[model samples]
Target: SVFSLKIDIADNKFFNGETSPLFSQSQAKLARQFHQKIAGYRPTPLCALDDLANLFGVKKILVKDESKRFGLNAFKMLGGAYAIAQLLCEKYHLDIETLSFEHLKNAIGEKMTFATTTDGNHGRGVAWAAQQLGQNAVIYMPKGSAQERVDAILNLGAECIVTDMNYDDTVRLTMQHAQQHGWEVVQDTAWEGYTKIPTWIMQGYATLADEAVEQMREMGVTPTHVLLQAGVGAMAGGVLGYLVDVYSPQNLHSIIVEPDKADCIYRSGVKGDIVNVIMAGLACGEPNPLGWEILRNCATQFISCQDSVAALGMRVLGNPYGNDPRIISGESGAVGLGVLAAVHYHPQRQSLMEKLALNKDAVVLVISTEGDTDVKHYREVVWEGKHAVA
Candidate 1:
């Protein structure tokens, strides 16, 4: 069976709306500075896939390779670690500007238990941060989460619990547990009263965008389009928010991509509200309200695509064309690139390209958010032809 992509061109009425100041350039700079103070912190590579771009009929394709982030094989830790640091700084009455890994590690404080729910990378990030700061962490995963992900969290010395419910239900369970145990909930999504930490988490994600902008500038290139994959829209919101500030929303054609099984952001863009929603990596049912605001106001398009789109991306990136460097992108991390590949090969390629304004002059930017985080599944998709497009 063949599955086609769905596109929702954002209403122009939502354009040029105000974005939050929290994602401003200065704030992103601060986030980058904080990330720089952490051990093993370095800017991930922004790979210019010139050969692939030429093959795809684009001016250039720049991919920010986040597989090398913090040796975690994913970029989730940037938010988790920064949020934890901010929480501690607030608790100890220390300025975030004065924060450093050594100083934060030496600060005497009660061992706070940080709790969160995840499908995988985010929990590992929270666990990793807690361990670094000499604190405790409790992580919960939704049903059918990969055992490899659970083990990764457990290896970080956190209490990893697998729930029998779906992702949203698991989040509710985590909240209930956190309330019962007085644990601090550090989630990436924001609800009515829980905006602060999630805002900080989103801000933390700006470091990646910050680095990408600098890399682009150094290369004498300015991206005309950016493809961002959204789960709860945290990373997309964070990164897009920063990019919008840097390049202006109207100047950049931003597209948000999600799996057809869990395309809440896409649905929200179409219907204009929180709605019920797959890729397990992007298996979020609701939008982060904070992220949704920025996206609703600034994004150019939202795409709900088949899971095979992501699988195709994984295969394409792992097997480079010409002299393009291979990127080991996992399903969730590769969807942005997936969009480009799917659009190029679609039966309605001409119409879709026209809709997206993709042309020979377009310079597209994407973030490969993870490596082969689940090696078994990655091998199945990339090597065994699982989810191969028909």
Candidate 2:
């Protein structure tokens, strides 16, 4: 099978239940404001793939291009940089709303060190933020992580350590190192007593959702369906939370997509408990508890799909159909759109379309969360036909 789908039994139950304020419009506005204060801050493009939409039998296909995000080529920095700012604000007892980037940059205080573990993007984000703040960052990556990714972090003047462990164990090692050196651990996933920073990180991600909402409105459209790709479900949860808040859960069809190799959220949804689960970006053994809660309550469907699905998306977006704008999407970032492409081309397309409630009326939204972060692998998939489904 190329993909498996799980319908969330409790989908949209939050419509009648209490919703958290974490990703509320106001919070997202705050995050967006903070991001605006950063150098080179600008909203990334919301590309309308009209031809693809017509071909796929959808009313609209909007892809948020995060590859243009801050020249970092990924959206991870939005959360990392904002969370770092929040940490600094709390440390100095200064109000974030009242502080400017220059104020934070010039504030005289003891230099601090931040630590984290990542497969790639997040570490580079933390390293970049640390560089901007004149602070120190120690980034650890799991064994077999891409050298290009490691080099990206090292180029930011951060200490990049490659460890001979899996991502989860590497996270544990990061925690230990952070504790030993009294460095702050800024990770995207959440656990008990460790929710605050991750919460901040998640909220920071809502800036993109905020921008997308505004962008959609400017285009005189409203999304009927949104496909969010997840690793630990941080970005998916955060963005979905905000979108649900804006449009109400009942009005939106939200799908959480993941690589079959790392489908913790899908497994957790099925079992009603946390499960361990890769697409390197979507690879993880545990769900972020904070993120899982939102997905459990609000997301309509979860898809765990073969890597070929993502490769198909890479090829499809790289080589657009009928003048649809080209998008250079990476594996993890492309998986949500992959689900759409896969469903469209599947032998059971009609049934799957009905299953997903994707039809001619669907105004679909997908975020290209990253570009070609691993250029070689990206070329192999799009050019060399790696992971082709035929």
Candidate 3:
């Protein structure tokens, strides 16, 4: 399968989310302040794709590019840095306004340890935060995670252990190790005993959507549909929470995308029970109860796609057909476009397109979360695609 490949759409369904505020203005203001202090902090680009709009029969297609967020090539740094600063401040009795990495290190030194699990980007974000703040980081990943991803963490001076199990199992393993060794868990997913940092993490993601909204307003448009590729649903929850708060109930349509192999949110919403799967980064065996609490009623629809769909998206972005600025997106980052493309052409997915209102008047928004974060995988897929999207 190449550019023409279509995904196996799990189920196309929509939920009418009642309006409510998931986070306050003060939290967003605090997150903005925290991110502003970060070095090389700049709002990533919001690119308008004319070609894709015409191809998908939409009014507009906007992609908020996050390939170089804080020079980390992923948006995870926002959450990682915010959670780190908050935790450090609590431990050292420091104020948020004046806190710095140097100050964190001077006060805590090697005594501070941070730990987490990941398929790729999240671990790198945690490791980079730990290294920058002069703390120790211990990371765990599930089996079949790319070596380059592991090395990226190692390069940040953090310790990494690759487990033979799946992503959820690695999360459990990391929790056990951190609890045994007295390390603070800075994971993106939340559980019963761990809510604070994950709360901070999800709040940090609001800055991303906040910026996107501002940018969209500046462009004289508001998104009709938002396609969020969810792992544990943290980022999607944060974005949807803000959209639901700002836009009227009838104005915005939010869709959550997941790997068909590991679709917790999709399964959770459709089956009315949280289930598990083995889709690596998105391979969450269970839903994050905290995230599920928000997404259950907010997101308009849930779409699950296969790896071939993601591969096709990578090719489309890497080798754009005419005037469609080529974007170098990784597997996870390209899933949004994958779902979009599948629903546009795949006969089996026509129902999803209709349910989500993918018509010529629909304005779409997607995010390219990373760019060639795994260099080898990127080269192998994009270069080997042979048939560019001309």
- Supply the global lDDT for candidate 2: 0.86
TM-score of each: 0.96, 0.95, 0.92
The residue-by-residue lDDT of candidate 3 on 2-100, one tens digit each, is 234434344334455654454534576689888888777899888888898898778998888888687788888888878988898888788988887
lDDT score for residue 243 of model 3: 68
Q: Estimate, for each residue in 1-390, the C-alpha lDDT of model 2 and write its tens digit.
A: 444333222233333323567777888898998888887999999999999999889999999999999979999998898899889888868788776766545667787899999999998998998888778899999999999999999999999999999899999999998999899999998888898889889999999999999999999999999999889989988898899999987788888887777778878877877887556778778999998888887888787777678888888889999988999999887877877888877767787888889899999999999999999999999889988776
Candidate 1 on 1-390: residue-level lDDT in tens?
234655444433455656668787888888888888777788999999999899778899999999999879999988888899899888877787777666555668577899999988899999999888878899999889899999999999899999999888999999999999999999988988999999889888899999999999999999999999998899999999999998888899998888877888888888787886756568777899989989988999888777788888999899988999999999998988988888877778777888888999999999999999999999999999999887
> Which residue runs of candidate 3 sit more than 4 Å off their true CA positions?
1-16, 106-110, 278-280, 348-352, 386-390
Worst 10 residues of 1 by lDDT: 1-10
Alpha-carbon RMSD of each model: 1.9, 2.5, 2.7
Better of 2 and 3 by lDDT: 2
Give lDDT: candidate 1, residue 326: 90
Compared with the true structure, all predictions reach lDDT values of 0.87, 0.86, 0.78
Instruction: Predict model 1's lDDT versus the native.
Output: 0.87
